[PDB]
Structure formats: structure tokens, C-alpha cells
Design an enzyme around this catalytic site. Structure first.
Site, mmCIF file in Angstrom:
data_model
loop_
_atom_site.group_PDB
_atom_site.id
_atom_site.type_symbol
_atom_site.label_atom_id
_atom_site.label_comp_id
_atom_site.label_asym_id
_atom_site.label_seq_id
_atom_site.Cartn_x
_atom_site.Cartn_y
_atom_site.Cartn_z
ATOM 1 N N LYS A 197 0.859 -1.182 0.000
ATOM 2 C CA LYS A 197 0.000 0.000 0.000
ATOM 3 C C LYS A 197 0.896 1.234 0.000
ATOM 4 O O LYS A 197 1.976 1.213 0.603
ATOM 5 C CB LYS A 197 -0.968 -0.007 1.201
ATOM 6 C CG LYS A 197 -2.008 1.125 1.260
ATOM 7 C CD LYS A 197 -3.125 1.021 0.216
ATOM 8 C CE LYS A 197 -4.290 0.146 0.612
ATOM 9 N NZ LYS A 197 -5.179 0.030 -0.565
ATOM 10 N N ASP A 237 -7.279 4.156 -4.700
ATOM 11 C CA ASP A 237 -7.857 4.142 -3.355
ATOM 12 C C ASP A 237 -8.359 5.572 -3.116
ATOM 13 O O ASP A 237 -8.667 6.253 -4.108
ATOM 14 C CB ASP A 237 -6.827 3.645 -2.332
ATOM 15 C CG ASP A 237 -7.463 2.968 -1.090
ATOM 16 O OD1 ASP A 237 -8.334 3.594 -0.451
ATOM 17 O OD2 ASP A 237 -7.058 1.826 -0.720
#
Lengths: 458, 458, 458, 458
Positions: D114, D154
Site C-alpha cells: 500500500k 484508493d
């Protein structure tokens, strides 16, 4: 800011820098350099990585590796590697940030960084240290290189670790280059590396003495009080003798040795001490000889400053906070006109204030002149840079050639401190410029302006 | 050939070279070097690329970038970057080709190239220039590097652009290296870079004077006529004074200043002029002082050559075509025995013919000896090369060290011109070898033979 | 804008596109796309490089190599290699520019480029072509790659050259990947490679035949006019025989054979013609049998169309400018309702605008429908991208698999041509949409929108 | 262990996993996997880097960029990019850690990472987001790649940002490859990208509906409770209508619309709601017609569940912590036997343990069955890996092809969740296996075993 992690040790350093810059005329003449302080305080790059290795019980072990690459405006990232259980990012951003501006002061092309691991060298075997360095270096090499990032030693990373790390980089990158400093003599290390910080201190003070007296005086015939018994204080003492000066004091963990009357240590004496320190014997066991004896007075439990009598130069090179306020007064009362730190943070704030107040109140050479370690130490940082240069030619200069270049690098530190204080901390007519304030702004302004030239900010 | 684009400026340069080689004994002794001329005239590599950027109106902008990489037999590609609306490939092949052989003359390891953009710096803000350099350098870095291709400044690319371009290469390649020359002093620039072309001219003429007189004479006690007021002419003048010579003239865009009688400018005077030029004041506003006054005669609208009286050396360093035929006769009539161009193409063909005819007709030191700028200028090209060398060690040499190396490089230019004329343009018994013809063949033959050694042709 | 060179062939292509746009409703609905037009017309990167090679006499030889990497918004650069004495940068930009938009129409991920050299394959031995391809590829591999730039055949580069180019790439990059298309079957080639283009025109016009006359007035019982007798023409003819069509016409460069009545060529006959072309023989094979003396009227050194008699689809697949205007009008006399270019630039402007005028006049399905080779030709380009995909998949698909995907890629062309123009031309009055105007501004808008999604313009 | 920083969100994730294990029979059958737990929780590599960019005022701006490359045992790093003012390393580790095991469940080859930045997209112009993405990507490309690390969308990074990020990658790496997912259709995007997640929950719970009630008590005639009215909710609803189900409930952030009797939403209605959301309008569209005034009871600013009446599957797909406990109990009153998270973290702990308690109590198929978004959400993550595969294949699959493979990847999730827990939870007494406990320790064991096969631990 609700995002920002608490990094105490780093934030401490930022706070101190911003305070130093604010207490000058810099953000008056150049208010836009506040933008510089904003941008520089974020590292250019930070790498963290898992380090997995095998102990002598054959058990898998996990630690965390880091390389903070903070600034590279002025050269490749340069700074040490620390293996120590307390290591974390906040510690390494503090050290790395600091290194940016101590490397700038030399006037060499060295950026700033710091790296390491939370690996603990205590209780580890030689082979455990090897297996770690190999795992460590396996990921690190992706991120360093001779024209990119040149690490070095620090706590927990001696010549032993440097060698394992170099040999693993070699294996991986199939390359032989100045990717690490502090290397062995057969494989790319530099001469004068031992004498460096001690010779450097004396070369720095030599420019201080020159300036303050218009070339009238030098170390020729001056009484020097040194503290310390190890690498920095031995070679500081040797240089001072070479220059015709008198070394009147040395000290260790448990006391001071003082020259009675007029006198000096001799090179053979220094060598004798050296030999005691490699054995971890105390500089008391030499006055047990009938040599020394009435030549020397040994004061257990005491620092040298009050007991040297009258002195001209003093060179605290033992540990941190080794010169108190009162001891600073004492040196002043003894005629001391030059103080330079061989040890990092050897003078307490009380002692600095004492010297900096005397400097403001007494014109010219009547003052005592205080120089911070970040400029006087810088010898070791300099021979690092000379090691890199020697690795580029694949040549080994003579000890004479490395000494000469070190002498210059040391003049650059004096000049960066002097000239920056004359501009941004201008003293009143007849007062010596503050070498402490100068040496604190100097790294920042050099870096910032070059950052501007390069478009890091605008 | 029906394929070949018309590249006027490039074809012009080829034509001039082929004519120079043809008017010698080279293709007699070495007819196969016509193959060399064929192969060298095609660049090794040419890169063109779209440059997209944002103006202060936030509007997308398109320009065209170029890097001609012409020859690398003798070292990495080296040559400048020009940002100017007229830029195209044909312009940059001309300059690049020329650079191959001017870099060869130094006797340094420098190949030849030239690059740039049709971007116009006029009316552009500092930030617009930054946004351009960043877009420009983003594609260029793929194609350059410290051991590959080292660009530099030219029209439209000053130290301002050099810094943006360096800082963007840094970001992209994660590297700190001598990838550009002309850098700032904090980040990898070189001392003596200002004094370079002017000191170089005087060092070149110093070898001319030595040769022509068997070491009997030097700049000691000679009257020198300089033209120009800027960087080249200031430091040429300083060196001449340092050597014991007398600088009798300097000039600017609107007139000449002449020493009345026997006399010279002094370093303080040069400095005064320097100060007028940084302000864009005219060297008339100093004879408005009562200083100067009857020491100097100011001739508005005029060049110095006829009015210096008797002269020994002259150093046209103002602009192009600044010495006409008639002025060349005048210098000859005044006893001038040495002429060297500080300015590129300062002497008109008429003036060259005049000097080259006198040289052929008068034995030894009775002649006037003309030296083209492509060898006398070369100082700036040399300190570029010294900057690269300094970047390799990550060291900064003293001004004394860079001066000394420049002195050598300048002897190499003299020797490459002298020796090539003795072989391929052999003068008759007692005539000085043509330094112009020599300096025109010399770069070609050096490059070509090394190309042969390396198998570029056979 | 004087800086720019004179590039005829390229400037022509830009002009034609720029007039196709603006003669549409695109720039009113999307005025900011004039910005797209400005940016896309500058190539992303251009590389030119000297190619030295040895002829069979052992003589050094110099030619010039190129690679125009024009646009890669929609995928890696893809475009062919032309070895021919006329090559220059202006021609290659024209082709590269056109390839950008031709590749976009396939709906594959293929950017646009073009490269080659002015090397002349005529008179060259096999060994000289080998030597050249090595030398050419040695510099080229630096600039290409499976995921970067995939070249392919064009005039001077057949499967022979592709193989020499691939080998040397192997040796240099130590890789083996879809870096070139048109490769042998043992080493990375695709089935349906030879058929490809010919199958593609038939598939394209099949969808043209579907949309006009929706009730499947298909290739079923059409007498189709073909020209060419090359591999494009022979596989075009095979496909239409398989579709239930009747081939009435094939032609040789000098030569034209017609089915005198109702009837067709047979696959067996095609096979005979193919053998004749392997022998560089002329048709002249109705002589072989009074059977072939019937069913066949032969017209040497001239041309088809006018004499074909009455019908319905024409497929010019011989060379450029199949002599036009008149025959085009004759094809409207015969019930020719469908004309698609199997040869690039097969219809001259006079036949284009003739067909496009008839479309204007006769409402849907009464009109002759002209399709530009920009869609009809795209069969080859399509199996090249499929050769790439197969190289990725480490697999060699069945002929059935690659034919099926080709059939779809062809429908994409038709769809991009049909849906565009029905937007930005909107034919009106129930006319067929312009497949010429549609095909052209479709490629532009696809590229330009993807350009804007990335940052290429704004 | 004091060295370590304070990382709340991450430490929480570790604690929750470490308690899920050890509350299972894994560590008795495999005690050495506590070693796995220790190693996997340190990220393989972490990168932080300063991002400098220019706002529309021309002002320099500083933010911080990250990329946590946590684990790659099962494939390249894969994980999204969040631009939001709260970002820091602790949050990104939490997400990265969770992504490791969520990606493992798909049975694709996808490691876990991430990244993002504390850059705030709010109030930023389109040009400022472009400028940031360039600056962000310039450093990031050094650390990512098609076969190395594939980021994706995201919070702060939509298809707009992905496009700006891709372009700059193109410009820097000269590549074009599956380096980012969620790309436009013209340049490497996938069909079924928008549907994906919504289709995935329905497919997941379909297999839950198959296993409980083996005799295909399927979506056929279920009245399904949905919340969300976003693209997750609208494609979830379309899919269940296609399965013969009845959508009874959609909800807006403020808003909740219920089928008052037996009946459903229609695709045409979904379409209307989608249009409303393109207009940022609220439901408020039963007002449009007394028809929609019937079939629909509307409850503003509140919430579904309790008022849906009696039935059977609930799909919370609005946001985090859909207000819980009570409604959860209401859903057991209605015959709700299946609840799966379409929104990440949609059920608050009170609703989880409520559902997991009912499962304990009511034997198989009498129980409500709760599935964690860790499997139900995984539809998106799955078409991202499919977008990668398509980028590799140089192909753009049919919607049918990508839907079919999605259907399978969903069954893998179910299977990894079901077979695990039936091992390491073993429900007993003919209870349904915990799909919450199964889904969690499944990802761990898959990664940890592959870790051990390679040398990552032992």
C-alpha cells in the site's frame, strides 16, 4: 500535522536549527529561506527493510534496517551506520539531518544521511555479525553506490562490520568502488585516518590563532591543555608538539595528568599512554613509574582545567559536558584565549555562554575564542572524503598528501564559520565573529542556496 | 544524396574543413584519411524529443529538444546547450562538428557534441525557465551521464539553467556526478573558471613569444593592445600585467581607452572597469573622473589598433570582425609581432591574409604571428575539462592547481598547431609555421587517427 | 516558426489531417483538441545514428539509420523499417505519423513509429545485407524492446532482414522476446502472417457489406474485382471464394486477367498463379489450356476495372495510384457498391472524391462506399500485434485462433470508422457515414483523449 | 522493544490477527508458524520520499510520499494509493498488512503493499493534481514495475490520477506495461472494472447460498437487502436481479428507499439512480410518479434493515460501520440467513459477534452466515489482477471472459475461507464453518507456507 509521527529526537534538532536561524539576520536579508528550511527538513528519500538472519543456534532472527537519505544538493549522500537496539527512524532522521550541515561545513561535496539497524551487537559472535552484515547489505546495495550514497561507521559498525558490508556489496554489484568509507589499508582505506580528528582540531585552532592575532602568534611556544587519552587527544597532542607548542595536560576516565611547571609531554610519552589505552590500563599506571614522577602531577577524579595554571589553548577531547561554567571561568582566568572542542558537545551551555560573553566584551585577542566541535572535529569527516577521492583514482596518496588536503579542508571550516558570522551575526567594531553562531548557520545557508540553484525550492 | 536534407550551416562547416584539408599535404601523405572525413561527418548519434511544459498562464507549451552526439573517439561527448528560437538540427550539427575538433586541440579527452532547444528565453519568467529545464532534462538524462555526455552552457543557458538542469538530473538518476559543466561553487564548479579564457590567451601567446624568439623574449616589458571590456579582456589584461607587460588599450561597445605615452593599466583600473560593466556603464564614465584624465585618451566610436602607437602584442577580445585589413596593416606598421584572438572570429579574412602574408615574407621574429581563436580561446573549454576531473575526485583543487593545469593544456594547443603545420603545411626555410593552418588541420588528424586505431573506419 | 526544417511528405500529412479535422464538428464540441493536434504532431523521440559496415570488397561504407518513435499513448511504439536509398527523416515522420492513427484503429495497444536507413538493398549480396543488419541493430537495440518499441517489415526489410536483425538483438541484449514482428515460425512467428492483410480487407468490407444492405447482401454471389496478383491479392481472393463470392480479376505489374463470363478463379488456379510469381513469371497461363483460354480474357501491360463488366466490389491491391477517375466512374456503371484499398494509397484523389461524391448523392445502399486502406490494410498490422501477444504468452496459436481475433480487430476498424463520422461528420438525409472521414478523425480522437488522460496535454 | 515507534492502526491489525490465530488449532498442529507470524509482520521494504510541487499560485509545496511493499511471497506487490491529509506510515502499514492476506485469498499471484501521500485532493484544481502526480511519480517509478509492484486506486486516486501517474511513468521509464491498474479502456484498462466488486459480492454469497442449503436455495426469489446506491451497490443489485432475486432496498448517504411490498427494483430504475448520482442528487424520485410513490417507501437521512421487513440476504455496501447491533438482530427476525460486506468494515464488531453467535447456536442453514469483506470485496482486487494479465497478453478480453474468471476467483475466496476454519476452527455439532475466522487465517497460512518454501523463514 495530525498525520506527523512524533519523532522527538528529530524534532529536537529541527527546533534548535530554526532557533539558530531565527536568532540571526538571515531571515531578514533572505526571508524566502524559510521555504528552504521547510523543504530541507523532509528527507529526499527514506528506505526501511526487513533484515532476516541466522544465529549460532541456527534460529531465524528478524531486525529492521534503515537508510535515511536526507539531502544530496552538495554531493552524494554521506553519513554513518549505527547497529544498536535503540535505533529507529526518529533517531536516524536526527543524526542524518545533523550530518547534512556538518558535511556542508567542510566545503567538500558531501550530502547528508544516516542509516543502520536495531540489531544488537552485544553478545553476538563474529559469525553472527557476518551473517547480519550479509543480510543487511543484500537489500542496501540496491540503494547506495559510489556516486549515490557512501555510508560509514558509527556505533556498532567498526572496521569489522565495514569489511563484511563491503565484501557483500562486492559480491552483489560485481564492482569495486568507494561505496563505503573506513576501509582496510589493503582494500581502499586512507592514511592519516587515525591522526585525522586530532590533527584537524589543531589545524582549525591554528587558523583561529592566525586570525585573532594578525599572524603575530601561532602554536609556537603556547601552553596547551588537552583532555582525553585516546585517538583524538593523542594526535592532537603530537601535532601541538610538532608545531613548537607545549602539551601540559591529558586525562582519562579516572583522572588528569599535569605537567609540573614549564614543560610538555614528549612524543615518547604520548606513545607510552597510547600503549596503556590499547591494553585498557589507566594513565595512572605510568606515574607509578619513576619516569614521569616529579615531572607530572596525577589528580584522581579530576579534570585538568583548574590545575594547569596559566594556559593559552585548551582542547577538551574526552567526552560530553566536560567543561562546566566554573571551569570555563578558570580557563579565562588563566589567560586562555582559544578553546576548540575535539569531543562532540564537550562544553556545557554554561561554558559556551561564558566564552561567548567574554568574546563580546573584550576586543580582538583579549577575548577567549570558542569553536564548536562540529567544525573542529570535522577531520574525520574530511579524511572520509579524501578516502572517496582516493578510491576514484584507485590510488593511495602519501600521508604527506592526505595531511595537506586535510589542512585545506580545515581552513574551509574556519572560513565558513568566520564569514557567515560576519554576514548574519555581525559583531560590533572590534569583536571577534562568533565561530559558534557562524558554524551553525553556515551549513544551512550553503545547502539552501545550492538547493535554490538546483530548483529544489523556489 | 537526393535523401540528404539541406543543412546550410552544417554543409558550410564541412565545406570549409574539406577545403582546409585539401590545401595541405595531408591527403598526399595519407590519402585514406578521405575515408576519415567521410565517416566523421556523420554524427555517431542524434536525439530529438518533444518538450512539453506549462507557462505562467498555466497553458501547455510545445518545443523541440536536441542533443547531437557527434564524435567520442577522444572522450565523452562534450559541448554546449543553446536555448534559442532559431535552434534546429542543422544549426546544432554545425556547432557540434566544430566542437569535435576544438575539443581535440586541447589534448584532453573530450569528444564533440552540441544540444539544446528552440525554446525562447525572452519574456520568460524564472519559473517558466525552471519548468522548461525540468521537462527538457527529463528526457535528456536517458542519453547523457558523466562518462557518456557532459553538456554545458551556450546561448540561453547560463548558470541559472545549468542549475535547474543539474537538479533535475539528480532527481531522476539519483546520482551526483560531473554530468554538466559550469556548475555553482558549492555544487561542483571550478575555480579559475572566470579567468580561464583570458589567462589562456596570454599563456598561448607566451608560447608563441618563446618559440619565435628562442626564449629570448616574453611578455616582460612588451606593450599589449587589448580590445574588449568584459570577462575575457579583463583577465587577459591582469595576466599581462602579472607577467611584467604593459596593457595599453581596452575598449567597449562605444569606444577605446588608450594609455598616453609609455604606461599601462593597473589592476585597480581593470577592477574599476569591471565594476562599470556589471552595472552596464560605459568605459567613458571613468575618464569623466579626474583620475584617468591625461593618463588616458578616450576615442568614441573607434577601435584601438591604429591609435596605440607602437605595439608588440595585440589581443582582439571584443566581438567578431573587429580587425580589418587596414587595421592589420597598422598593427604590422607599429611593430606588432604577435596577434591572438580572444574573441571568436575577431579578425576578418582580410586581416588574416595580411598577417599570413607577412609571416611568409619575413623570417623568424621579423614576422607577425597570427593565432586563431579556436586555439587561443580554448581556456574556457579547458577549465570545463578540469571541472569534470575535479568532479571525479569529488575534490576542489586550489586556484593555483587549476591555473597550472590550464597552463599545460594551453601549451598543448600551441604544440598541436605548431607541429601539425610543420608536417602538413611545412614552411620554407626560416618561416614560422602557420598556427592558423596548423590549428585547423590539427583537430581533424588527431580525431581521425584515433578513429582508425579504434576501427571506426578502415 | 522559420527555425523548423522543410519536411515535404510530413507537412503534407499534417495538412491533410488538419483539414480533415475542422472540416468536422469535432473542434466545436471539443475546441481544446486543437491543443492535442499541436502536441501529437511533434514526435515523442527521434533517433538518428551512423551505420558503418563492410561490403564484399572489404570497403568501409557509411549510411544513416533512423527510428521515429512518434507516439506511445496507446501502447509501445510499433512501426516498420524501410531500407531504401530515398529514406530521410521527413519521409519516416510521414509514415510514423500515419502509423500512430492506423494502429489506434485496431483497438490493440500499439503506439506509432517508423524507422529504417538510406541503405540500398539493390545489388547487395546476402552477406552485405547481413553485415549491414548487424551494424544497424547494434545501435538500434539501445532504443527498442518488447515492452518499448517493436519494429517490423517494410520496403527494404523482409523476413530475411528481420532474422538478421533479431539475431544481433539476441547477441546484444541476451534476451529473446517479441522485439520484432514478422519472425520465422520456428523462432516466434505467427500463423496467418502471410494471409493477414488479404484476409483483413475481405473481413473489413464484409462489415461494410453488412451495414449497407443490412439483410446480408454479403460476399455471397458477388463478382469481386481484384488487382495485384501478389500475396495480398491471392489471399484476398481465396477468402472471397470461401465466402461464396466470385473472383473475376487479377492483375500483374504489366498484366490483367478477367473471367469472361459468370464464374470465378478457383483456389487451385490461385495456387498456379502463386507458383508463377515464385518464378517471377507473368500470368500467361490461359495459354496452358483451351479451358483457361475460355473463362479468361487477358489484357497485357494494361489494367482491370473497365473490362471486368458489371459488378459489385473492387479490391485494388496492386500498388499506389491504381490509374483513376475514369475507371472509378466505370465501377459506377457496374453495380460496384463497395471499394476498399488493399494496397496503401491505391485510389488516387480523383477516384476518392468521385466515390465520396456518389455517396453524398445516392442515399444509403444505392451508393458506392469507399474505405481507406487506413482500416482495410490494417490486417497485417493486426497479426503483428497478435505475434507480439503470442510471444508474450510463450505460445504459438492455431491458425483458427489468430484468424478469429483478426476478424474481430477488423470489425473494430469498421466500428471506429463508422461510429466516428456518424458523430463528427453526421452524414444527414439517410446517407451512409463517410468511412474515409470517420477512419481519419477516429484515430486522432482515440490517441488525443488517451493523451489527455495521461498528462501529455491539457 | 522500546526502539519501535507507536503505530496505532497497524498494531491493532497485528493484535487482531495474532488473536485470530492461537484462538485456532493452527499453532498446535504447526507451532513453528509463530515464527512466520513474527517475520511476515515486518514489511519487506518501505520507501518514504519528499514530493515538491507547484500550486496554481506558483508556490512551492511540500508533501510526503510513501510505498509500503509489505510481502511478495505469492507475487508482485499489489496495493492501492491513498491521497488524503491523514496519511502516514502507520495507516499505510495497516492497509498494506491487510492487503497481503486479502490478495492471497483470490488465488492469484499478488503480494501485498500500500502507498500514497498526505497530499490533500480537496480544493485542488485539475492542474494542481496533475503537477502533484508528476512529482509523486518521478520518485515512485524507481521502486515499481509491471513485474515488481503494481499500485492502483484508493481514496484520493481515481481514474483521473491513475492516468496522470501512468503518463509520467511512461515518460520516465520509456516502457508502457501493466504498472498501474484501473487504467482507461483505450490504454490498457479492463472490462467489468466498474461492475467487478458488486458482481463479486453476489458471486461470493451465491457460493455461501450454495453450501448452506445445498439444494440450491439460491438468489432465485430472495428479497435482498442492499445499502449504498454507489457503483458497488448498483452492480450488486443488477447481478441479483439477473439471478432471479428481488432488490428491496437501496440507500443514500442521507437516504433509504424500500420496496413496500413484494417486488424489486428494475435495471431501468438502477439506471435512473445512477443518473441521479452523476448529478449528486438524492433518491427523491418516487416523487416523479405515483407508480414510484407506490412500490417505494422512502426514509430520508436514516437507514435500511429494520424497515425492509422479512428476508434473507443483506449486502451492506455504503460505508464503514453501518450502525449495528440492533438492526443485525432485526435481520434475524426477517429470515436473513446471509450477510456479506460489500463495503470494507461495514459491520461493526457488535453485528459481527451477533452473527457469529447465532451461527454458533443455530445448526447449519438455520444460522445467519456472516462473510467478511475480506472475500466479498475481493471482486475489485480480482479484476485488477485480470487487468494485469490482459496487459501481459497484449489483449483486451470480452466482458464475458473477464466475468467468467471473476466468478472463479470469487469461488476461490469462498473455498480458502471454508476449507480453512473447517480445519483450524472445525465448527463441531454440524455447525456452518466460520467464514470470518476461515477467511482470516487462510490468507496467513497461504502466505506463510509460501514464505517457508522460499527462504523467508525456517
Amino acid at each position: 500535522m495530525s498525520n506527523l509521527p512524533v519523532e522527538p529526537e528529530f524534532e529536537q534538532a529541527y527546533k534548535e536549527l530554526a532557533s539558530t536561524l531565527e536568532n540571526s539576520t538571515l531571515f531578514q536579508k533572505n526571508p524566502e529561506y524559510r521555504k528552504a528550511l521547510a523543504v530541507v527538513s523532509v528527507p529526499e528519500r527514506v528506505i526501511q527493510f526487513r533484515v532476516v538472519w541466522e544465529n549460532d543456534k541456527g534460529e531465524v532472527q528478524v531486525n529492521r534496517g534503515f537508510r535515511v537519505q536526507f539531502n544530496s544538493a552538495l554531493g552524494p549522500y554521506k553519513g554513518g551506520l549505527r547497529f544498536h537496539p535503540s535505533v529507529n527512524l526518529s533517531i536516524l532522521k536526527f543524526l542524518g539531518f545533523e550530518q547534512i550541515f556538518k558535511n556542508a561545513l567542510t566545503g567538500l561535496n558531501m550530502g547528508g544521511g544516516k542509516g543502520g539497524s536495531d540489531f544488537d551487537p552485544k553478545g553476538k559472535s563474529d559469525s553472527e555479525i557476518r551473517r547480519f552484515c550479509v543480510a543487511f547489505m543484500t537489500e542496501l546495495c540496491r540503494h547506495i553506490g559510489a556516486d549515490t550514497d557512501v555510508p560509514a561507521g558509527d556505533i556498532g559498525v567498526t572496521g569489522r562490520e565495514i569489511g563484511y558490508l563491503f565484501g557483500q556489496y562486492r559480491k552483489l554489484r560485481n564492482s569495486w568502488e568507494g561505496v563505503l568509507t573506513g576501509k582496510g589499508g589493503s582494500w581502499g582505506g586512507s592514511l592519516i585516518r587515525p591522526e585525522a580528528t586530532g590533527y584537524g582540531v589543531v589545524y582549525y585552532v591554528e587558523h583561529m590563532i592566525a586570525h585573532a592575532t594578525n599572524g603575530a602568534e601561532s602554536f609556537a611556544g603556547k601552553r596547551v591543555a588537552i583532555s582525553g587519552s585516546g585517538n583524538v587527544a593523542q594526535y592532537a597532542a603530537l601535532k601541538v608538539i610538532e608545531l613548537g607548542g607545549s602539551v601540559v595536560s591529558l586525562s582519562d576516565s579516572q583522572g588528569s595528568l599535569i605537567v609540573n611547571g614549564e614543560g610538555s609531554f614528549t612524543p615518547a610519552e604520548i606513545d607510552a599512554i597510547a600503549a596503556l589505552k590499547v591494553d585498557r590500563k589507566q594513565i595512572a599506571e605510568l606515574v607509578t613509574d619513576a619516569a614521569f614522577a616529579d615531572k607530572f602531577t596525577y589528580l584522581p577524579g579530576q579534570r585538568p582545567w583548574v590545575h594547569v595554571g596559566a594556559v593559552d589553548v585548551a582542547l577538551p577531547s574526552a567526552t560530553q559536558n566536560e567543561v562546566s561554567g566554573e571551569e570555563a571561568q578558570a580557563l579565562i582566568a588563566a589567560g586562555c584565549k582559544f578553546i576548540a572542542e575535539g569531543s562532540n558537545m564537550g562544553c556545557t551551555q554554561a561554558a559556551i555562554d561564558a566564552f561567548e560573553a567574554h568574546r563580546e566584551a573584550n576586543k580582538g585577542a583579549a577575548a577567549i575564542w570558542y569553536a564548536p566541535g562540529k567544525a573542529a572535529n570535522a577531520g574525520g569527516v574530511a579524511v572520509s572524503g579524501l578516502e572517496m577521492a582516493q578510491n576514484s583514482a584507485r590510488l593511495s596518496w602519501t600521508a604527506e598528501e592526505v595531511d595537506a588536503r586535510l589542512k585545506d579542508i580545515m581552513k574551509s571550516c574556519f572560513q565558513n564559520g568566520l564569514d557567515t558570522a560576519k554576514e548574519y551575526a555581525t559583531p560590533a567594531d572590534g569583536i571577534l565573529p562568533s565561530l559558534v553562531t557562524g558554524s551553525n548557520i553556515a551549513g544551512f545557508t550553503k545547502v539552501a542556496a545550492a538547493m535554490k540553484d538546483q530548483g529544489d525550492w523556489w
